[PDB]
Design a protein around this ligand. Structure first.
Ligand SMILES: Nc1ncnc2c1ncn2[C@@H]1O[C@H](COP(=O)(O)OP(=O)(O)OP(=O)(O)O)[C@@H](O)[C@H]1O
Ligand SMILES: Nc1ncnc2c1ncn2[C@@H]1O[C@H](COP(=O)(O)OP(=O)(O)OP(=O)(O)O)[C@@H](O)[C@H]1O
Ligand SMILES: Nc1ncnc2c1ncn2[C@@H]1O[C@H](COP(=O)(O)OP(=O)(O)O)[C@@H](O)[C@H]1O
Ligand SMILES: [Mg+2]
Ligand SMILES: [Mg+2]
Ligand SMILES: [Mg+2]
Lengths: 173, 342, 345, 86, 230
């Protein structure tokens, strides 16, 4: 799992993208790179023991509609170190870094009942009090809560479900 | 799954331009500092075994050349160094002052005077690491080296050009026997060298005092690497003494070198190795610890007069030179089975 | 042209990269210019795309990353035959006696397969050493192997010298002496002994001394054995004297640590028995000719029980085990009659 | 601007154009050679204990089936083999 | 510096009969008490403190490194009830404290002893247990990302011991006299830490459990205790 080796490439690529302001374009470039890594015929090649130069240039020939100067050179660095499989994780961490820089957050709202638009509106306002970032609410419907709303801002969770209140009470006794 | 000194601003530099310009291959930057080992990024032209110059007047020896890294050991107080300092590779292997004027002096392993009697009056510089004379350049040992102890001189003869191990436990008289052997050469025409590895400084002061009471000090060179000095200096200390002994050997004179606690050298090379993350071996010693002592002790030779004429460009004719070695080893309760003693 | 580049230099191990098409084979040889001096490399492993891990046959000092390397497309090959008699050579087969070029007509590779099972020969002609304990307790045949087992300072070199005097002078044929990890002083003593005896012109000498890098000492024995095999295939009966087999295994251990082989028991290489067997099986007498072999083996600490002495016992026809205890009491030769024997008895 | 399905089809197209094909499940290539042990990339259908056929009428045994290579041992003189052999 | 050092032959009598006859200790030198667990290397040092303080007039420093708090508390109240406390400076880093404290407490005590030396005085420096200092480095070493050496010790053991030992020394301006207790693990006098400690001392007194078990105290082994002054 490449969670720990993806950070340097994500950070460096994001800083360079910021200096040249084409952050959205860089995200497109990385999305394209992540999808070619999932291909059945490429995922076989990436596991073979080819020398980095040959392997990279095959990938670069396949990777049309990227910028030679910058994006394809990121590809070269990752090929040297044998880390092209880190691209599906470098993409996620680049998106995280962008969300942090743009002071914008994505959070999930979960309930057994489909929420009314006024409920979602007040949720967004309250969350923007709790969180400095603006919030994009994601609606998930799950009968598990049985009632109430589960607020899931990533690792930070506020539980407002009856079932949670019940299984919390059961351990008090 | 691990990083390899791929870090943010270096990666950003390579992102801007992958085929980064030639610039100078002569220089680089420190990226890590710990326990007297530094990692340097750059130095594309650094040779294995080369001296790297550091800020101030300090040096390091390039021991590991790896894929975009150089591992180097610092030959002095390292804790003042910092990440991001520039470093420049010299063209130089380590060399030490050498000559007749070193007699009667006490010097560190870089040949700097440490007794306070003023600057040296050496006769040029010699490489610390050098190859021994070949098979056809030797001559058989037949002249004696008179120790002065009845038991040794009768039952265990030592000749000019011999390598005689002195081995025993702590506090068994090893140092005393060796230094008495130096004193007996006070009026013998054999120059003496005493190199002390890892010993406490006041013990060296005490033996120099005994060497000064007798007339022996005016005939000997003392090379010191105390317990407070870096492992690189202790590890390199025997070879500098050998390089000073080879001056007399290659010019048709006789010398006697007393390596003291060659074991306290082996510990030093081990420290360097394990800090440089090389594969460990038996008792965690590096695999190439035999090669260390093997290429040190094989310099002790007697060389035929044709080698002396070829070296001195005919200035000295018809005289053989010699270098006699007396290594000292410490046993853990006498077990010869240990790796360094064996 | 030179088609490869050095990518790492760690002690005696040099990493070289080539284009993925032209990767040199295992035990191939490569050549690089170290300062003013030509340095030979021997390929040990093919790892990844285009990279070979190699062992240096000389001093590693002065090597840079990015030096060009040329793939000589063959193993190390040495001069063999009549032109080697009376000459001293190193691991590469270069002359180190300062008498000029060898002037050979043929060169053979030091890596080769052993004689086939079908090709072996059985004969039991006894040979007389003139030494009581050896003739009595461990009689020699002709074409067998003789191991002299001992720790430090017990008489291996004196016994080998006396055996050389007694067997060689009467032999009326060629001989090869291999010095593996031998003291330079003793090599000079032996050379001057042979020339003063006026027998030097029937003996070929190969020396790899203690000070030499692990690559040199590792492959010296194979060089001497290749010369012995050249004389054997001409149809002759030859003597092969190997001054210590232990440091072949020990150079292998030093090399093995840095080759990335996982360590084994008592710190030895995993391949210890394989390496020993690949050396010893070549030393035999076939239906075309005979090699007679005398080998000294260092037993560490007189243990006689650690893997290197243990593995070497299997290969030998005659076994003489010198004991420190008998020598210490002052009796020479120090042969232990209770542990020494020959399959000719 | 393009969608995931679009990008997936374009990736497959350009992979086809530049000829980065995959191995056949019963075949592979040697990628490392050392001390009588050889590493093979491919052989997706090889089973542990199976015999792997080498050039020159030589054999090997599949002992270490791994995610990205098959560690095999040569049953004869191994020194001929090279990285890149089928 | 080597140029700054000094040497003296002056016998400094200690009351204990065995130490003086077998291993005489001179003023301005180093003395080491080697022993396993519970063989008397703390109590012997308290007798030395009593007897040496008879003929010594100057200041003294005591470094409690990784030992029992109770020993230090008892010591402090003995010093204060005899009014000799006015001349002793104490640093405590005892065995309940986390590794960093126990590692750097020794260096602190040396800093104070060096001040009183550099004022030109003569100073007595007592170290409660130097073994703990190397062991704290062992406890920290693997977490710092360093491959183990010998019997699981840190690879830099010899330098860590040397860099501390070389500055507890006499100079041409003043002199430090020091007694160091040296714990040996599992009664193994060949263990690398005690083994490298032997080389740094002038008089070494080796205690043994076999002699203590016979009732004979102080349990000095005369066939291993030695001095540079004999
Ligand atoms: N011939 C002798 N007669 C009397 N005492 C001797 C003799 N030789 C040595 N000694 C004494 O032996 C003691 C230890 O000396 P020395 O330091 O040389 O021993 P060592 O075995 O080399 O010790 P270490 O390895 O601890 O330095 C000294 O007190 C010295 O005076
Ligand atoms: N002179 C003595 N007479 C009788 N008993 C003694 C003597 N010296 C020491 N002991 C015994 O040794 C015990 C422990 O003393 P001390 O604290 O000096 O030992 P130690 O080896 O330094 O132990 P530790 O490392 O646990 O502190 C005492 O309580 C006592 O029983
Ligand atoms: N037959 C012998 N007669 C006298 N001395 C001998 C004899 N064999 C061995 N020695 C002694 O052994 C030492 C040299 O032995 P050598 O064979 O060179 O050592 P090793 O056995 O380690 O090669 C010298 O002390 C030499 O006197
Ligand atoms: Mg001594
Ligand atoms: Mg020998
Ligand atoms: Mg106590």
């Amino acid at each position: 799992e490449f969670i720990t080796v993806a950070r340097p490439y994500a950070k460096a690529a994001f800083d360079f993208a910021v200096e040249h302001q084409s952050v959205e374009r860089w995200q497109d470039m990385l999305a394209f790179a992540a999808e070619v890594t999932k291909n059945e015929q490429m995922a076989e090649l990436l596991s073979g023991a080819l020398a980095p130069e040959t392997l990279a240039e095959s990938f670069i020939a396949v990777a049309g509609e990227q910028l030679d100067e910058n994006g394809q050179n990121l590809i070269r660095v990752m090929a040297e170190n044998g880390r092209l499989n880190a691209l599906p994780d470098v993409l996620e961490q680049f998106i995280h870094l962008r969300a942090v820089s743009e002071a914008t957050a994505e959070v999930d709202v979960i309930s057994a009942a489909a929420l009314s638009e006024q409920q979602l509106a007040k949720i967004s306002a309250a969350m923007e009090k709790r969180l400095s970032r603006k919030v994009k609410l994601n609606a998930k419907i799950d009968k598990s809560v049985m009632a109430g709303v589960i607020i899931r801002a990533g690792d930070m969770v506020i539980d407002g479900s009856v079932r949670g209140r019940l299984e919390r009470l059961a351990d008090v006794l | 799954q691990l990083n390899s000194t791929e870090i943010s601003e270096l990666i950003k530099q390579r992102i801007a331009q992958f085929n980064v310009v030639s610039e100078a291959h002569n220089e680089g930057t420190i990226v890590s500092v710990s326990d007297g080992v530094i990692r340097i990024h750059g130095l594309a032209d650094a040779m294995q075994g080369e001296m790297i110059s550091l800020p101030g007047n300090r040096y390091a020896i390039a021991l590991n050349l790896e894929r975009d890294s150089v591992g180097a050991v610092v030959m002095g107080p390292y804790a003042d160094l910092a990440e991001g300092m520039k470093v420049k590779a010299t063209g130089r292997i380590l060399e030490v002052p050498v000559g007749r004027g070193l007699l009667g002096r006490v010097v560190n392993t870089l040949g700097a005077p440490i007794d306070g009697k003023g600057p040296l009056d050496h006769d040029g510089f010699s490489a610390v690491e050098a190859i021994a004379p070949g098979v056809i350049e030797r001559q058989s040992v037949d002249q004696p080296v008179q120790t002065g102890y009845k038991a040794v001189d009768s039952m265990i003869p030592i000749g000019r050009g011999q390598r005689e191990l002195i081995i025993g436990d702590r506090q068994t008289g090893k140092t005393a026997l060796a230094i008495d052997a130096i004193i007996n050469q006070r009026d013998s025409g054999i120059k003496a060298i005493y190199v002390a590895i890892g010993q406490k400084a006041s013990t060296i002061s005490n033996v120099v005092r005994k060497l000064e009471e007798h007339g022996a000090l005016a005939n000997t060179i003392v090379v010191v690497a105390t317990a407070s000095e870096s492992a690189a200096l202790q590890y390199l200390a025997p070879y500098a003494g050998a390089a000073m002994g080879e001056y007399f050997r290659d010019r048709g004179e006789d010398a006697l070198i007393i390596y003291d606690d060659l074991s306290k050298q082996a510990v030093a090379y081990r420290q360097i190795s394990l800090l440089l993350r090389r594969p460990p071996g038996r008792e965690a010693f590096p695999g190439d610890v035999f090669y260390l002592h093997s290429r040190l002790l094989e310099r002790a030779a007697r060389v035929n007069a044709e080698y002396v004429e070829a070296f001195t460009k005919g200035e000295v004719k018809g005289k053989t030179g010699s270098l006699t070695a007396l290594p000292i080893i410490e046993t853990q309760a006498g077990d010869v089975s240990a790796f360094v003693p064996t | 042209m030179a088609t490869g580049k050095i990518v790492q230099v760690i002690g005696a191990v040099v990493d070289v990269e080539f284009p993925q098409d032209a990767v040199p084979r295992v035990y191939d040889a490569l050549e690089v210019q170290n300062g003013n001096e030509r340095l030979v490399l021997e390929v040990q492993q093919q790892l990844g795309g285009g990279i070979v891990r190699t062992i240096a046959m000389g001093s590693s000092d002065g090597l840079r990353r990015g030096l060009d390397v040329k793939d000589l497309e063959h193993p190390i090959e040495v001069p063999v035959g009549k032109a080697t008699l009376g000459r001293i050579m190193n691991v590469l087969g270069e002359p180190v006696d300062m008498k000029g070029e060898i002037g050979e007509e043929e060169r053979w590779a030091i890596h080769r397969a052993a004689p086939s099972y079908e090709e072996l020969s059985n004969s039991q002609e006894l040979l007389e050493t003139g030494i009581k304990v050896i003739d009595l307790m461990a009689p020699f045949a002709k074409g067998g192997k003789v191991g002299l087992f001992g720790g430090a300072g017990v008489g291996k070199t004196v016994n080998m010298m006396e055996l050389i005097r007694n067997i060689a002078i009467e032999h009326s044929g060629y001989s090869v002496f291999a010095g593996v990890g031998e003291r330079t002083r003793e090599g000079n003593d032996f050379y001057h002994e042979m020339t003063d005896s006026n027998v030097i012109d029937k003996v070929s000498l190969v020396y790899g001394q203690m000070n030499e890098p692990p690559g040199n000492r590792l492959r010296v024995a194979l060089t001497g054995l290749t010369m012995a095999e050249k004389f054997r295939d001409e149809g002759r009966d030859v003597l092969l004297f190997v001054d210590n087999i232990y440091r072949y295994t020990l150079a292998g251990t030093e090399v093995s640590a840095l080759l990335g082989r996982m360590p084994s028991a008592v710190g030895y290489q995993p391949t210890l028995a394989e390496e020993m067997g690949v050396l010893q099986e070549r030393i035999t007498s076939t239906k075309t000719g005979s090699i007679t072999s005398v080998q000294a083996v260092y037993v560490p600490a007189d243990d006689l029980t650690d893997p290197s002495p243990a593995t070497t016992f299997a290969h030998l026809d005659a076994t003489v085990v010198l004991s420190r205890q008998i020598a210490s009491l002052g009796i020479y030769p120090a042969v232990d009659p209770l542990d020494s024997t020959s399959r000719q008895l």
